[PDB]
Amino acid sequence: DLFSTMEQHASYGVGRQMGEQLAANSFEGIDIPAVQAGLADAFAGKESAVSMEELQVAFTEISRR
Amino acid sequence: DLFSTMEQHASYGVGRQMGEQLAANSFEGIDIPAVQAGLADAFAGKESAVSMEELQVAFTEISRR
């Protein structure tokens, strides 16, 4: 209670659902630490480490399997 | 190229979209490190650190705002 146990467990389960979704529809070479960084940065409303222009170039290049 | 740059950037952007979605519909007290752990564990197909029975109890308790 002092401890955040219900919150931690629920958070962990939210993460699991996301990881399951990624594993189902990811791309070859997806980098989990970078996904994790992006998630934390965006949740906190922090400036993207990668410009929107660089992101688009990456998505576009990846999209072509 | 040797470097995984397109893959890293795209991964980071995937994470950002998830973080944006969470920030929009999260719960009070959501713990980002736990989300990150859950995501990595599930992507890798690793056993959940929290039993399905504990997860359900957590979700149920949280669901009541």
Side-chain angles (χ1 to χ4, degrees):
Chain A
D1 150 35
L2 290 175
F3 299 95
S4 299
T5 307
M6 297 296 87
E7 296 88 343
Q8 297 245 346
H9 282 182
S11 298
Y12 181 85
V14 163
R16 282 203 74 99
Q17 187 186 44
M18 294 174 169
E20 284 165 18
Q21 281 177 193
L22 266 194
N25 231 288
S26 72
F27 55 96
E28 151 139 34
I30 188 175
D31 177 280
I32 291 315
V35 179
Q36 290 167 326
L39 189 157
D41 287 353
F43 185 84
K46 174 154 66 128
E47 184 191 14
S48 176
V50 183
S51 72
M52 294 296 108
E53 197 182 317
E54 290 180 299
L55 285 181
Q56 195 44 246
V57 171
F59 295 144
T60 296
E61 258 214 13
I62 297 306
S63 284
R64 343 181 167 274
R65 294 95 207 204
Chain B
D1 150 35
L2 290 175
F3 299 95
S4 299
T5 307
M6 297 296 87
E7 296 88 343
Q8 297 245 346
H9 282 182
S11 298
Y12 181 85
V14 163
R16 282 203 74 99
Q17 187 186 44
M18 294 174 169
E20 284 165 18
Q21 281 177 193
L22 266 194
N25 231 288
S26 72
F27 55 96
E28 151 139 34
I30 188 175
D31 177 280
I32 291 315
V35 179
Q36 290 167 326
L39 189 157
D41 287 353
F43 185 84
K46 174 154 66 128
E47 184 191 14
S48 176
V50 183
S51 72
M52 294 296 108
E53 197 182 317
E54 290 180 299
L55 285 181
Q56 195 44 246
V57 171
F59 295 144
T60 296
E61 258 214 13
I62 297 306
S63 284
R64 343 181 167 274
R65 294 95 207 204

